[PDB]
């Protein structure tokens, strides 16, 4: 019993964090096999940030200008290249703590764990989600650039996120191939996020989690249709629900005996009437950063090693 915002165990990723220094800038890198990955703006000064020409700035950098420190392990840089918005530094030592891993570009709505690091040292871990406007609502301070987000399937780490804080206080970054999520660029120039809508399939998954845990007050006598529900979602800035989403919710439907469309009718009533000062799973608002997989994992206890 109980339902918590739960991150993956971070140990497999902690062994990969290093500090990367170029001139006077220091941020975090990801050391996997004999390559170190970090944001390319490590080569910039605060002044370079307004309109950086990264190809031109890289001309004046050689291997020995990049200092990489793994704790106190000093790493020798033997090559460097730029791939989209990440720098890839070839070092002469394979990381002996490299886990089984893959790089994945996640879709909006998907969740992941963040290991926030500073000066190459992990400081905390938390859960968040790729928002529909391709920002994340993280917790990051200066020096956190190069911190990574990931999921873990048994023994394999799936890295999905690595760059900046917008003036609005939300966060933008890349996949591990260096392509930004959404339209953001690594330049200090006007960029605004776009509508932050609610991840409907995740809210439904969390209502199923609530039923499994005994929070049942929101179940009602009604049902609805996909098209009728989606009219309501549009009014409340909820993402449309698709048949694919209904199928993904099938296992939770089968565990609880509540058809997806009946749960949609409960969500519809919650969106139109509010929670009336009540709570669900300890929350006074509808939570949208648990995926269906998140709910099954935490309500079934799958494990990783």
Ligand X SMILES: O=c1[nH]cc(-c2cc(-c3cc(Cl)cc(OCCc4ccccc4)c3)c(=O)n(-c3cccnc3)c2)c(=O)[nH]1
Enumerate the active-site residues.
41, 145
The answer to whether 106 and 122 are in contact (CB under 8 A) is: no
Angle between helices 292-300 and 200-212 (to 10 degrees): 20
* Distance separating alpha carbons of residues 207 and 193, to the nearest angstrom: 28
Is the Cβ–Cβ distance between 24 and 16 less than 8 Å?
A: no
User: Is 282 one of the binding residues for its own copies (CB under 8 A)?
Assistant: yes
Contact flag: residue 250 with its own copies (CB under 8 A):
no
- Quick check: 181 binds ligand X (CB under 6 A)? no
Among 35, 125, 193, 261, which residue sits at the site for its own copies (rule: CB under 8 A)?
125
Residues 211 and 219: beta-carbon distance below 8 Å? yes
**Which phi and psi angles does 9 have, rounded to 5°?**
-60, 130
User: Could you tell me the smallest distance in angstroms from the CB atom of residue 99 to its own copies?
Assistant: 11
The position carrying tokens 């935490």 is 298
Please state the closest distance from residue 276 (CB atom) to its own copies, in A. Answer: 12
191 binding ligand X? (CB under 6 A): yes
Task: Select from 39-47, 104-112, 243-251, 297-305 the region that touches its own copies (CB under 8 A).
Answer: 297-305
| Cα–Cα distance, 44 to 292 (Å, whole number) | 41
Give the contact letters, 156-175, x = binds to its own copies (CB under 8 A), - = no: ---------x---xxx----
| 299 binding ligand X? (CB under 6 A) | no
Yes or no: say if 208 and 218 are a contact pair by the CB < 8 Å rule.
Answer: no
CB of 36: closest distance to ligand X in angstroms?
A: 16
Yes or no: say if 163 and 85 are a contact pair by the CB < 8 Å rule. yes
Residue ranges that bind its own copies, judged by CB under 8 A: 1-12, 14-15, 71, 115-119, 121-128, 137-144, 165, 169-171, 213-214, 274, 277, 279, 282-285, 297-305
Residue ranges that bind ligand X, judged by CB under 6 A: 25-27, 41, 49, 140-145, 164-167, 186-191
């Amino acid at each position: 019993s109980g339902f918590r915002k739960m991150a993956f165990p971070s140990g497999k990723v902690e062994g990969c964090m290093v500090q990367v220094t170029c001139g006077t800038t220091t941020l975090n890198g990801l050391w996997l096999d004999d390559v170190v990955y970090c944001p390319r703006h490590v080569i910039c000064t605060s002044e370079d940030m307004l309109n950086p020409n990264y190809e031109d700035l890289l001309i004046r950098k050689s291997n020995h200008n990049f200092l990489v420190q793994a704790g106190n392990v000093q790493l020798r840089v033997i090559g460097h290249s730029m791939q989209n918005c990440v720098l890839k530094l070839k070092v002469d030592t394979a990381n002996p703590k490299t886990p089984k891993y893959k790089f994945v570009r996640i879709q909006p709505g998907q969740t992941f764990s963040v290991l926030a690091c500073y000066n190459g040292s992990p400081s905390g871990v938390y859960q968040c989600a790729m928002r529909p406007n391709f920002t994340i609502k993280g917790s990051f301070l200066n020096g956190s650039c190069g911190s990574v987000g990931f999921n873990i399937d048994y023994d394999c780490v799936s890295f999905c996120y690595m760059h900046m804080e917008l003036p609005t206080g939300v966060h933008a970054g890349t996949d591990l191939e260096g392509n930004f999520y959404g339209p953001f660029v690594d330049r200090q120039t006007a960029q605004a996020a776009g509508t932050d809508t609610t991840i409907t399939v995740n809210v439904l998954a969390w209502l199923y989690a609530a039923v499994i845990n005994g929070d049942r007050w929101f179940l009602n006598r009604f049902t609805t249709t996909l098209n009728d529900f989606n009219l309501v979602a549009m009014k409340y800035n909820y993402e449309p629900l698709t048949q694919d989403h209904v199928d993904i919710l099938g296992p939770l439907s089968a565990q609880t005996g509540i058809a997806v469309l009946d749960m949609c009718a409960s969500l519809k009533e919650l969106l139109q009437n509010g929670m009336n000062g009540r709570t669900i799973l300890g929350s006074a608002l509808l939570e949208d950063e648990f995926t269906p997989f998140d709910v099954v994992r935490q309500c079934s206890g799958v494990t990783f090693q």
